[PDB]
Each structure stands twice: as C-alpha cells, then as structure tokens.
Amino acid sequence: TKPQAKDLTHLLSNESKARQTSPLKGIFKYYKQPGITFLGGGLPLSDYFPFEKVTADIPTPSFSGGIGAPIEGENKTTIEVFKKAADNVPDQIELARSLQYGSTFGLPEFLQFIKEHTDMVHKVPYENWDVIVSVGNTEAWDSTLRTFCSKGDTILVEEYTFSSALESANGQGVNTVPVTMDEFGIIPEKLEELMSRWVGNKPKFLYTICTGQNPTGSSLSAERRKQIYDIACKYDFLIIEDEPYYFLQMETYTKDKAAREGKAVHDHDEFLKALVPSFISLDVEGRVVRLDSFSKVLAPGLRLGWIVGQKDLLERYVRLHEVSVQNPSGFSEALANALLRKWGHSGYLDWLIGLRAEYTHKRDVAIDALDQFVPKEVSSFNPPVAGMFFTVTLDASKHPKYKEFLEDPLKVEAAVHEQAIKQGCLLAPGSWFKAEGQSSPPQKNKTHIFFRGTYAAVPLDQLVVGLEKFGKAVRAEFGL
Amino acid sequence: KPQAKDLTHLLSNESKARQTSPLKGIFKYYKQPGITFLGGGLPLSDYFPFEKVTADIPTPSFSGGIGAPIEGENKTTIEVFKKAADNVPDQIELARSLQYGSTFGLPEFLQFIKEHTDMVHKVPYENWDVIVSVGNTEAWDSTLRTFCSKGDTILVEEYTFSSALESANGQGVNTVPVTMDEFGIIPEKLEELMSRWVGNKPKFLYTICTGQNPTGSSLSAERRKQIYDIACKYDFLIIEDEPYYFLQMETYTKDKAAREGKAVHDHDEFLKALVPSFISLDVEGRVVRLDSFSKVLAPGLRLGWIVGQKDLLERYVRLHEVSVQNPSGFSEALANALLRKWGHSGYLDWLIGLRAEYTHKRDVAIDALDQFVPKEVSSFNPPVAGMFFTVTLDASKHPKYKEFLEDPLKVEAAVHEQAIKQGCLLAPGSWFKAEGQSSPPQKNKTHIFFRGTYAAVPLDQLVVGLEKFGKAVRAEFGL
Ligand SMILES: Cc1ncc(COP(=O)(O)O)c(CN[C@@H](Cc2ccccc2)C(=O)O)c1O
Ligand SMILES: Cc1ncc(COP(=O)(O)O)c(CN[C@@H](Cc2ccccc2)C(=O)O)c1O
Ligand SMILES: [Cl-]
Ligand SMILES: [Cl-]
Ligand SMILES: [Cl-]
Ligand SMILES: [Cl-]
C-alpha cells in the first residue's frame, strides 16, 4: 500500500470549492429500496428507447496486416450491444443502461478497463488516485481551467503551444505566462529561475503537452520530467499533462536505414519498458492531472477520454461535469467498452504497438526527406521521438532581405510561408503558436523561426513531394 | 421575412472577445489541388477501427405503440459504413463522422433538424439557424457563458430545475425568481417587476415553458405572447429550455368515454395541437431555444441543438470549439440515420405515439390523485405537458400548524416523512425554490406542494404509490 497524496484542496478555485450536489441527492437512497414507490425522480423509462441493439465491425488482434489493413475476413469481428443485459456477452453496458442518465464519474465497465490500462502503464505511486470520464481533452482542459483558476489567475504554458488551449484560457480571463523551450521542450533551469523570483500570487499550474508537444514535436526526457516535477513540488503548483499523443511514441530515429527493422519493440514487455515515464508515474504527491483521449488512438469522433488524478480533485471535476457536459455519448462509451473488452488489454496493447510501428515509419520518411531536401546552411531539425509533428528551424538572420525586413524574423517567416505556398506546399508558421501573457501583478523584466509539419495527414509519397517543394522554397528565399 | 434585431449588445464582454483559431489563415488551402497541405493536425481515417456501425430501430407508423418489441416488421436495421460509397444516400460515413469537423455540426444532421424546426415552429425572421449541442445541460452552461458575466442577473421561474440554478451559481450569475401560479409565470407581475427595475437590466429570462420542472405547468399561448411583449419592451432575451416540448398531451377530462374522440390521430391535427414556441413568436430574434433528444429518443444520445439568430449562435460555436468540441460522431451519425430512415413523416408518427403514451400515463396519475388524495386540504392542476404532476396542500389546515409555529416547511417535512413511512416518495416543492438578488438588489404563504412523475414506474405501481400518498396526507391532516 502506497502513501496518500498531499491535500491540494487549497489549489482549487473559490468557485470550484463552492459547487454543490443536487438537493435531490437527499432522496436518492430510496431509489433502490423495494417497499417504496419512488415518484420523486425525473428518469424516462428505457421501454421507449428506439434502439434494440447497436453493432460495429472492428479489426482483430494482433493486427498482423497492420492497423490500417482492410476490416474484412479474418480482420473483421462484429461487436454487439443489445438493449437488455441478458442478450449480451459478459461485461457490456446494455443500451437500457448506457442510453439512460447515469453517474457523471462514468459507466463502471468502461472505468474498470481504463483504470486497469492507466495502472498497467503509469503505476500511479499514491493510493487515493482515480479516473473519471471526459468527452475528450478539449473539454477536460476547459474543465481544468474552471476547477483550478479564477479570472486574473496565472498558469504556466509552453512558450509555443496549442492555440485552442490558449483560447480556452483567454475566455476565462486566465493569464498564460510562457515557459522558455529549446528544441527538446521546457528548459527546467529557466522554469526554476522564473519561480525562484516569482512576484505576487503563484501560478496555479503548468500546462504541458509533454509527449509529441504541439507544435515543436519535442518530448520531455525522463530527466527533464523529474526536474520539472521537483519544481512543481518545491513551489506547490499542479502539472496538467495534456497527453493525446502519448501512444504516438516511436523508435528513436537513426540515419542508418539498414538498422531500422531491428529497432522495433518485439513484445508487450519491451513496449511498456520503452514508453517515457508520465508525470502521473512520477507523482508521489498527487499534484498531477493527466488528460487522456482516444482521439489520436481510435478516432476523434468518439468524443471520449478520461482524467487521472487524486480522488478529491476529480470529485470537483464531477460536480462541474454534472452541470456542463453531463456524460459522454452512451453510444461512444458502450461501443468503446465493447471494442476494448473484445480486444482485451492484450489486443489494445497490440493496437498501440501497431500504432507505434506506423508512426515510426511516417517519421523516418519525413525526416529522411528534411535531411535530403532542406538546405543545411540556414536550417536545422530535431527528429521527433513521439507525436505527429516535425519542425524545420531557419536562421532568419541569413535571409538576403533581413536588413530590408527591418531585421524582423516574422517577415522572413511570412516570405518563406508565401514562397512554400507558391512552390505548392503548406506548413504552419511557428509564430502562430506563440503564447503571450503577464501575471497580475507582472514579473520583473531571436533570429530563429520555425515551421510545423505533420507526417500523419497525407500519403507518404505526397509527404516527400511536399518537403522537396519546401526545400526549393527555402533555397529560393535564402538565395542558395 | 424581416432581419432579427441586432442583439450583439446582450452578449457578455467575454463572449464578444472569443476568436477563431489562428490556423483558419490556412484552412482555404486545405482542399486545393496543387498544394501538399502539411499545416494541419488531422490523424488519418485509414486507421479508424470502425468499418461499420448498425442499429436495430422500430418501424413507422409504430401502430403497436412506440414501446412495442423491436422485432419482426417492427425492426429496421440502419447501417453507417466508414466509406460513403457503401451507404444509402444522405448518411454521415464514419470516415467523416469519426473525424474532427465543423463545431456547427455535421451537415446532413443540421439539415434534417433545421427542416424539423421550421416545420413545427415557422421561425418568423430570416437570419435564424441551428447549431448542435451535447444536450440541454451543456447548452444551458453555454448560454450562461455567452450572455452573462459574474454578478449579472437572469430571471428564473420561482420554482425551477436545480441543475440550471447550480450552473448559474457556479458562474456567479444572480437568479432572480419570477412569481408563478399553478399555470406558470404570471406575466402581469413580471411586467411590474421590470417596470420597477433598478440597475443593469437582467440579461434574459430562463423558462422551462412546456412541462415546467417542477410545477408541471405549461405557459398558455396568451401568457407566451404577454411575456414576449415584456422581453421586447425591456430588451432581454428569452431562453426556452424545452426538453419536454414533445411530451404535450391531450387536455385532461374526468370523462373516460370522451378521451379517444378528442385525441390527435393525424399529422395535421398534431401540428395544430402544439402550443406555440417562443421561437414561433420571435419576430425580433431575441429567443434562444434549447432542444434535446433526451426525452424523445434517449438521454444517452448526448445530442441536442440550439435555435436562434446567426450572430448569437456564432458565439456559441466559438465557445463550443474550446469546450465540448462536438457531439459524438456515433450519436450524430446514428441519429441522422434513424431520423432519415423514418423521415419527417416517421418522426411525426413517433412524436404522436409519445403524445398518446404520456396522455395515458397522466390520465392514470390524475385519476388516482382524484380517487385517493383528500380534497379537504389538497388541490391538483392536471398537466397538459411533461412528465411531472403536483399535489398542492394547505399547510395551514395541518392540526400541528400552531405547534409548527405556522411554518409550512414543517408541514411539508412531516408529510414527506409520513409518505416515506407509508411507502411512497415524492419530491418536496420547497427544494426547487430559486433565490437570488440583483446587484444592486431590487427595493422591497400557506400552500406547499410535492412533485411526482408518472413517467418513471409501471402504471400499476403508480396507483399503488398515490394511494399510499393519499393515506399519508389523511394521517398527517387527521381526516
Ligand atoms: C494539445 C492538444 N490537446 C487536445 C487535443 C484534442 O483532444 P480531444 O478533444 O480530441 O481529445 C489536441 C489535438 N489537436 C487538434 C484538434 C483539432 C481541432 C479542430 C480541428 C482539427 C483538429 C489540432 O487542431 O491540431 C491537442 O493538440
Ligand atoms: C429543464 C431541464 N433542462 C434540461 C434537462 C436535461 O437535458 P439534456 O442534457 O438531457 O438534454 C432536464 C432534465 N432533467 C433530469 C436530469 C438528471 C440529472 C441527474 C440524474 C438524472 C437525471 C432530471 O433529473 O430530472 C430538464 O428538466
Ligand atoms: Cl524531442
Ligand atoms: Cl517565432
Ligand atoms: Cl398548465
Ligand atoms: Cl414552497
């Protein structure tokens, strides 16, 4: 048995602490009892639900054909969720129950699978941890800001990060103070330094996309995670790890093409050992909240994820969920439960190992094309170890119009972006992801630009075409 | 038809400041031939592990009743394949329904639901639209976030839905109660409250106007007209939270033999019988309607929609993009398939079946209140819509009224405890009371009630429960 998490209820917003259960909780205990005719509720009867069953056709472990193989023949199984429990295989969420209102924590069969998944991978190192359902990391992030932040509070964000996360914070009047990165992500020394001289109320938390970081394609090393966790403990702020790309971890990139087949993980044990430690895995104090999603693993349209953290903080999310999103789609949760239990933990691991193999190959093709096509006199690139994104860094100070552009790297970025489009390829300008913010009160007191690309969006031949056109655009702009 | 009023001045400063993604600057290139688009984050439909989803649904015109077993001639299989080429027309193929998409909603679903909205409500200004929600719970949270800043005031029914007040409380939005009688908001007292209003006007009125939770009241056409006039006069919005709209029923009669003759049979009779919505009256575009499938299909869809003027709906979409993102593509693709397989004609058949089922449940409940509750100390308004009935009691006739210091809440508590002892549980009316004051505040009762539902238990158990409730009132009042 592990220690208890620290009491962090002092990091909740005043508004989150004041949230209450329904005044009709005070009759729920009679909802079970026979002898009592319960007329005090509002539940419709499952008798009219016009869904006798739902089915899906899904692929079959171990996905020996690759996870993208046609779903047919031996690679097709039909899962069925009937309305009535008696008509179902074991451990299903029958539609009479999954299509009824229920507990906002989530349906028990789904929570059990996703909790086992979480513990097998992350070995959460305090006793009083839990999982609750979300309708994806988008909602879970909105709900995080509502649970831990009042208007005028500060959070720390990666100095280049996800535009939607900043928009969500902006909408709630929460200041996003940027944390300095290098090509490998957050620099722990500058985060420590920032905190050591912090003026005014401390930030409530750090928001990190620590695996396959959007837009940098960086992943924090186990060593940087340890140091950042120590800073969160020393200055007493939470870490919110928004981790939709956790299972897009890949084999380390090598230029030696011949070495690549040999590098693949060979079984479930090698796979689990290869995964970078999560902040939850490090979280002896219970100050980590993890946002997990099926979006990049199964499909975005599930609108289903979960949140990992200490019981007493997750309870405040459940109160908010009751009067905001209520619960995920019963169809998504019943079908996800059916797929995961049909595959089993073994099959889901096979799926995640297939996902690793496919992304590893996409990344090798992307970075081989960067190495080949992009002029090195004015460019650099960090091969990603995780995620769907790659970046190309350019020394804007080498652009032959840099003086004529008033030494403004963003005018070089705009020129390269326009030239790329003229050459027939589009990447996302890095400056579009820049986070800006000041604490209240504010704290006291660059020639390189980059572009974000994805290797997950298009067929791999069109990827190579694209990046050749991007190399040309950089050669045209820099006169090479 | 005319343009709606410009009501952008009623948006919260926070809502007005919301922006689109900086990555809209490149979406136009996303389709274009000749551009290799690497600027996005869309994972690949090739890997979505769902080749097909199907559902077994009942078959119009639901002649055996909407709860008839879904088997034989009363079983249709709808199928949504991953690939468009594999589907019947007008489906949302899983390659698209399980992909990120417009937060407005998937086009085939929006088209059906907009057709339905106009067919029933005949929206009387040009620039109206519909957007998707994940139910009226979310749409209400989003309404507060779109039209209210902390310390703003909204008007609510004196007795209303606990989750709606909890949502407003979490946002620091004051809920000022509007006086009701057994038929709902009393317009004359709302006009008076507004005529005397000091300080910033309330942003809107929140009304569960059909099958009101918990009163079981439904505003008459006449009251809706009077309330609409007040909303236009003082320039506030009306938010009609209307999950129970299609639980409208035939008017109650004691005369069992009269019931079948006055029941709607036909589509034309059905559309004529429905109470006008506030959107049907909304010549100015100051109404937002929260619509849901929860009480019509099933709560677990987590799918509804919002009706209102385009420029206000665009602000809900900005919010939705960074809050719920979109409904489940399974929910949206399956609802689109069911609704299009039934068609508008089958959907009306379904809503006419729902009307008949609820009409009968209400008839059984009200016949049992009439039979078993002592008339000496009680009254009841038979609902014309919704899932709730109420029993009103004169607490001042309780033999312990003096012993209770003339506190009706002590009579309520005693009747509640006695009901539980006799084996029947209803919800005390006082639990639904709304309290609030504006900033600054506006300048400066013997009846109690209980909420029951006739929609939760089999009708034989309902009559069991109400006879026990009758015994409980008889014991407490000494009759
Ligand atoms: C950092 C980060 N957090 C969350 C998500 C989305 O998670 P979900 O809600 O699906 O569980 C992402 C994914 N980024 C996508 C999302 C998107 C939004 C609108 C249109 C297309 C795609 C992106 O924009 O790159 C994420 O990066
Ligand atoms: C006035 C009102 N508005 C919304 C809803 C729910 O709409 P949805 O989000 O399903 O579209 C209701 C219905 N109320 C239920 C909700 C519930 C909460 C907790 C546990 C069970 C059910 C009720 O309790 O009565 C509504 O009345
Ligand atoms: Cl890295
Ligand atoms: Cl930059
Ligand atoms: Cl009424
Ligand atoms: Cl009362």
Of B26, B47, B334, the CB nearest to A68: B47
> If residue B63 lies in a helix (H) or strand (E), which one and from where to where?
none
Rounded-to-integer distance, Cα B253 and Cα B367, Å: 10
For the CA atoms of A59, A64, A68, A70, what is the dihedral angle to 10 degrees? Answer: -60
- Tell me the CB-side half-sphere exposure of residue A102, using CA atoms within 13 A: 24
Q: Under an 8 A CB cutoff, do B323 and A23 touch?
A: no
- CB < 8 Å & 24+ apart, contacts of A171-175: A171/B14, A171/B17, A171/B18, A171/B145, A171/B319, A171/B322, A172/A145, A172/A146, A172/B14, A173/B14, A174/A145, A174/A149, A175/A437, A175/A438, A175/A439, A175/A440
Burial A401-430 (b: 16+ CB within 10 A, else e): ebeebeeebebbbebbbebbbebbbbbbbb
Closest CA to B9 of B216, B126, B147, B160: B147
Of A137, A248, A304, the residue with max ligand 1 atoms within 8 A of its CB, to mutate for a pocket test, comes to A137
Residues A129, A4: contact at Cβ < 8 Å? no
Sign of CA dihedral B412, B417, B418, B424: positive
The residue whose two tokens read 């193989």 is: A69
Ligand 1 neighbours (beta carbon < 6 A): A 136-138, 162, 209, 214, 242, 244, 293, 295, 300, 305; B 41-42, 100, 325
List, edge to edge, every strand of the sheet that includes B52-57. Answer: A77-82, A53-58, B52-57, B76-81
Rounded-to-integer distance, Cα B178 and Cα B160, Å: 10
- Tell me the CB-side half-sphere exposure of residue B368, using CA atoms within 13 A: 24
Partner A, chain B 98-127, Cβ-Cβ below 8 Å: 98-101
Residues A307, A129: contact at Cβ < 8 Å? no
Sign of CA dihedral B322, B323, B329, B335: negative
Residues B80, B91: contact at Cβ < 8 Å? yes
Task: Tell me the CA distances in angstroms from A382 to A125, A185, A385, B409, B424, one per residue in order.
Answer: 32, 11, 9, 70, 69
Q: Which ligand 2 atom sits closest to the C-alpha of B139?
A: 9
Rounded-to-integer distance, Cα B160 and Cα B429, Å: 10
DSSP state of B159: B
User: Which residue's CA is minimally distant from atom 20 of ligand 1?
Assistant: B100
Of A39, A52, A54, the CB nearest to B452: A39
The encoded tokens of residue B256 equal 């069992």
Of A18, A53, A300, the CB nearest to B56: A53
Collapsed DSSP state (helix, strand, coil) of residue B45: helix
Chain B residues lying within 8 Å of A300, measured CB to CB: 43, 98-100, 329
E-strand ranges in B134-264 read: 153-157, 174-178, 180-181, 184-185, 204-207, 237-241
**Does residue A55 sit at the B interface (CB-CB below 8 Å)?**
yes
Q: Under an 8 A CB cutoff, do A27 and B427 touch?
A: yes
- Tell me the CB-side half-sphere exposure of residue A350, using CA atoms within 13 A: 16
**Residue B48 is labelled as binding a ligand:** no
Ligand closest to Cα of A435 equals 4
Of B210, B217, B288, B294, the residue with max ligand 2 atoms within 8 A of its CB, to mutate for a pocket test, comes to B294
Of B29, B325, B455, the CB nearest to A138: B325
φ, ψ (nearest 5 deg) of residue A241? -105, 105
Rounded-to-integer distance, Cα B427 and Cα B422, Å: 15
Task: Tell me the CA distances in angstroms from A374 to A382, A391, B114, one per residue in order.
Answer: 13, 12, 50
Sign of CA dihedral B97, B100, B103, B104: negative
φ, ψ (nearest 5 deg) of residue A38? -90, 105
Task: Tell me the CA distances in angstroms from A251 to A274, A279, A358, B226, B295, one per residue in order.
Answer: 9, 21, 11, 69, 50
Ligand closest to Cα of B251 equals 5
**Does residue A54 sit at the B interface (CB-CB below 8 Å)?**
yes
DSSP state of B430: G
The angle at the Cα of A354, spanning A349 to A357, to the nearest 5 degrees, equals 130
Partnered with residue A263 across adjacent β-strands are none
Partner B, chain A 233-292, Cβ-Cβ below 8 Å: none
Stated in angstroms to one decimal place, the resolution of this structure is: 1.8
Range of the domain at A439: 1-480
Task: Provide the residues around ligand 3 (an ion) whose CB is within 5 A.
Answer: A 184, 218-219
φ, ψ (nearest 5 deg) of residue A166? -70, -45
Task: Tell me the CA distances in angstroms from B4 to B131, B184, B290, one per residue in order.
Answer: 17, 27, 18
The encoded tokens of residue B33 equal 């031939």
Closest CA to B165 of A21, A42, A16, A14: A21
Q: How many domains does chain B contain in total?
A: 1
Partnered with residue B159 across adjacent β-strands are B433
Amino acid at A305: G
Residues B43, A456: contact at Cβ < 8 Å? yes
Chain B residues lying within 8 Å of A421, measured CB to CB: 29, 35
Task: Tell me the CA distances in angstroms from A255 to A351, A369, A372, B416, one per residue in order.
Answer: 27, 11, 11, 77
Q: Under an 8 A CB cutoff, do B134 and A136 touch?
A: no
CATH of the domain at B269: 3.40.640.10
Residues B312, B288: contact at Cβ < 8 Å? yes
Q: Distance from A455 to chain B by nearest Cα, in Å?
A: 7
Collapsed DSSP state (helix, strand, coil) of residue B391: strand
Chain B residues lying within 8 Å of A35, measured CB to CB: 423
Cis peptide upstream of residue A409 (ω within 30 degrees of 0): no
Q: Distance from B253 to chain A by nearest Cα, in Å?
A: 23
Partnered with residue B262 across adjacent β-strands are none
Give how far the C-alpha of residue A137 lies from the chain's centroid of Cα atoms, to the nearest Å.
Answer: 6
Rounded-to-integer distance, Cα B59 and Cα B423, Å: 39
**Does residue B33 sit at the A interface (CB-CB below 8 Å)?**
no
Rounded-to-integer distance, Cα B170 and Cα B166, Å: 6
Cβ atoms < 10 Å from Cβ of A446: 6
The residue whose two tokens read 């090509």 is: A183
Residues A142, B323: contact at Cβ < 8 Å? yes
3-state secondary structure chain A: CCCCCCCCHHHCCHHHHHCCCCHHHHHHHHCCCCCCEECCCCCCCHHHCCCCEEEEEECCCCCCCCCCCCCCHHHCEEEEEECCHHHCCCCCCCHHHHCCCCCCCCCHHHHHHHHHHHHHHHCCCCCCEEEEEECCHHHHHHHHHHHHCCCCCEEEEECECCHHHHHHHHHCCCEEEEECEECCEECHHHHHHHHHCCCCCCCCEEEECCCCCCCCCCCCCHHHHHHHHHHHHHHCCEEEEECCCHHHECCCCCCCHHHHHHHCCCCHHHHHHHCCCCHHHHCCCCCEEEEEECCCCCCHHHCCEEEEEEHHHHHHHHHHHHHCCCCCCHHHHHHHHHHHHHHHHHHHHHHHHHHHHHHHHHHHHHHHHHHHHCCCCCEECCCCCECCEEEEEEEHHHCCCCCCCCCCHHHHHHHHHHHHHHHCEECEEHHHHECCCCCCCCCCCCCEEEEEEECCCCCHHHHHHHHHHHHHHHHHHHCC
**Does residue A17 sit at the B interface (CB-CB below 8 Å)?**
no
Collapsed DSSP state (helix, strand, coil) of residue B297: coil
Rounded-to-integer distance, Cα A38 and Cα A57, Å: 40
Name the experiment that determined this structure: X-ray
Cis peptide upstream of residue B61 (ω within 30 degrees of 0): yes
Chain A residues lying within 8 Å of B329, measured CB to CB: 299-303
Rounded-to-integer distance, Cα B417 and Cα A200, Å: 53
Residues A472, A480: contact at Cβ < 8 Å? no
For the CA atoms of A127, A133, A137, A138, what is the dihedral angle to 10 degrees? Answer: -140
CA of B277 to the centre of ligand 5 (A): 15
Task: Tell me the CA distances in angstroms from B156 to A140, A257, B178, B217, one per residue in order.
Answer: 29, 68, 6, 14
| DSSP result, B438-478 | -SSPPP---EEEEEEESSSS-HHHHHHHHHHHHHHHHHHHT
Closest CA to A271 of A291, A245, A249, A253: A249
Directed axis angle between helix B310-322 and helix B136-147, to 10°?
110
The residue whose two tokens read 């009680």 is: B378
Rounded-to-integer distance, Cα B165 and Cα B163, Å: 6
Strand B184-185 and strand B180-181: the pairing is antiparallel
Residues B372, B391: contact at Cβ < 8 Å? no
Rounded-to-integer distance, Cα A28 and Cα B431, Å: 14
Q: Under an 8 A CB cutoff, do A425 and B38 touch?
A: yes
Helix ranges (DSSP H) in B148-249: 162-170, 187-195, 221-234
Rounded-to-integer distance, Cα B104 and Cα B90, Å: 18
φ, ψ (nearest 5 deg) of residue B179? -65, 135
Cβ atoms < 10 Å from Cβ of A400: 12
Task: Tell me the CA distances in angstroms from A371 to A254, B120, B282, one per residue in order.
Answer: 12, 62, 62
Q: Under an 8 A CB cutoff, do B322 and A427 touch?
A: no
**Residue A214 is labelled as binding a ligand:** yes
**Does residue A452 sit at the B interface (CB-CB below 8 Å)?**
yes
For the CA atoms of B393, B395, B397, B398, what is the dihedral angle to 10 degrees? Answer: 110
Sign of CA dihedral B408, B411, B413, B416: negative
**Does residue A436 sit at the B interface (CB-CB below 8 Å)?**
no
Rounded-to-integer distance, Cα A59 and Cα A71, Å: 5
Closest CA to B322 of B151, B150, B163, B145: B145
Ligand closest to Cα of A224 equals 3
Ligand closest to Cα of B215 equals 5
Of B23, B300, B425, the CB nearest to A100: B300
User: Which residue's CA is minimally distant from atom 21 of ligand 1?
Assistant: B100
φ, ψ (nearest 5 deg) of residue A425? -145, 145
Collapsed DSSP state (helix, strand, coil) of residue B332: helix
**Residue A303 is labelled as binding a ligand:** yes
> If residue B106 lies in a helix (H) or strand (E), which one and from where to where?
none
Directed axis angle between helix B408-422 and helix B459-477, to 10°?
130
The residue whose two tokens read 């490149």 is: B26
List, edge to edge, every strand of the sheet that includes B427-428. Answer: B378-379, B388-394, B447-453, B427-428
Rounded-to-integer distance, Cα B98 and Cα B21, Å: 21
Of B37, B319, B454, the CB nearest to A426: B37
